[PDB]
Amino acid sequence: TAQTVTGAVAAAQLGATLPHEHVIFGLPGYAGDVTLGPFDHAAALASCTETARALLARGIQTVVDATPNNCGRNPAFLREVSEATGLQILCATGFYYEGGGATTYFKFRASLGDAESEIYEMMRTEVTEGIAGTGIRAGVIKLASSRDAITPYEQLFFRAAARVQRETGVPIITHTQDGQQGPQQAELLTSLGADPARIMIGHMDGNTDPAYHRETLRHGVSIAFDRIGLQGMLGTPTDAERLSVLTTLLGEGYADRLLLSHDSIWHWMGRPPAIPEAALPAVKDWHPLHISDDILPDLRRRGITEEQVGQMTVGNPARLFG
Ligand SMILES: [Co+2]
Ligand SMILES: [Co+2]
């Protein structure tokens, strides 16, 4: 079964799923700007429930919230959004990448002792018992790595997650920075005994060379084209460049190991973002209704079958998360 914010749900009851989204997200440091950027709970609940109902209208019954522990994760809020709409939401356990802030606490616990075991115990408790004494369990483990290498600090989380995976069978979803480290993440996690059928290497759309994707897929892991809609923003490709690589892979029989999401943020923590005039086309399609409205119908038009679409959106997440 899949462990959601409302409880255990059967694999067959997940339906169409978006494997990587953020109901609420705050980049590390947001809590420090609480005076001018407070959290308006009522306005956040209103906006998030509206987006959730819009997703349910598209046939999307489940969303996997990939928000790391240090990036504004709020399991109680996700439960409110779920209970109000009926949309199934899975939350995460894990920390963001090293160059993403809020890294010093565990970097300090590491120089002073055994941080790997402390990280392991955090992930295990959050998966089996609950988060912050609420009883709401994490249904996935979120891992993240830097661009140039999976740093020694980041490897502490990878080894810790691999152990929780062997013991509980919990899914593992990841973040890759600037389209690099995908084969390395897959190699590391599989060598540590983590189930390749329960691993999803994320941000794989950040690379436009299909050889890189095949190199990651060699390890038997599933890969996610999860930043769909975010076009030409700080290194990210266009949706046309993403779909070109996806159709090459779909034509090579990889349908059973390919996933699709937007990595959208429904409500930002801290102050609302001031998006520049030049950056408007980049974030135009970066919302959670884009795949349902534009991508899947465009894939059907390209030659991708209803079976292949249903495999990526319903079949793969029932196996990976259920
Ligand atoms: Co990410
Ligand atoms: Co994300």
Are 222 and 320 contacting, i.e. CB atoms less than 8 angstroms apart? yes
Gap between the Cα atoms of 57 and 209, Å rounded: 35
Between the CA of 276 and the centroid of ligand 1 the distance, in Å, is 22
Minimum-distance ligand to the CA of 265?
2
Angle between helices 104-112 and 115-128 (to 10 degrees): 120
The CA 263 to ligand 2 mean position distance, Å, reads: 5
Resolution (A): 2.0
Chain interruptions in the chain, by residue before each (C–N > 2.5 Å): none
Q: What angle do CA 249, 252, 256 make, to 5 degrees?
A: 75
Order across the sheet with 88-90: list the strands: 88-90, 60-65, 16-25, 265-268
Q: Residue 158: CB partners within 8 Å, gap ≥ 6?
A: 143, 145, 150, 185, 188, 189, 192
> Domain holding 97: CATH number?
3.20.20.140
CA of 244 to the centre of ligand 1 (A): 22
Q: Which residues contact 1 (CB under 8 A, 6 or more apart)?
A: 8, 9, 10, 11, 322
In the reported structure, the alpha carbon of residue 67 is separated from the centroid of ligand 2 by a whole-number distance in angstroms of 6
Q: Which two tokens stand for residue 130?
A: 């609950």
CA of 98 to the centre of ligand 2 (A): 15
Domain that holds residue 315: 1-322
Chain mean position to CA 273: 21
Experimental method: X-ray
Q: In what order do the strands lie in the sheet with 140-144?
A: 92-93, 140-144, 172-175, 199-201, 222-225, 258-260
* Residues near ion ligand 2 (Cβ under 5 Å): 66, 263
Distance, in Å, from the CA atom of 36 to the CA atom of 34, rounded to the nearest integer, reads 6
Nearest to 139 by CA among 62, 204, 51: 62
The CA 262 to ligand 1 mean position distance, Å, reads: 11
- Chain centre distance of CA 255: 19
Q: Helix/strand/coil (H, E, C) string of 202-270?
A: CCHHHCCCHHHHHHHHCCCCEEEECCCCCCCCCCCCCHHHHHHHHHHHHCCCCHHHEEECCCCEEEECC
The total number of structural domains that make up the chain: 1
For ligand 1, the distance from its centroid to the CA atom of residue 301, given in whole angstroms, is 29
Report the binding-site residues for Zn(2+).
20, 22, 142, 175, 203, 263
End-to-end CA distance of the chain: 5
Structure tokens at 215: 């190199």
Residue type for position 246: L
CA–CA dist 153, 155 (Å, integer): 5
Q: Which residue, 144, 121, 155, 299, is CA-closest to 206?
A: 144
Q: What DSSP element (H or E) covers 147?
A: none
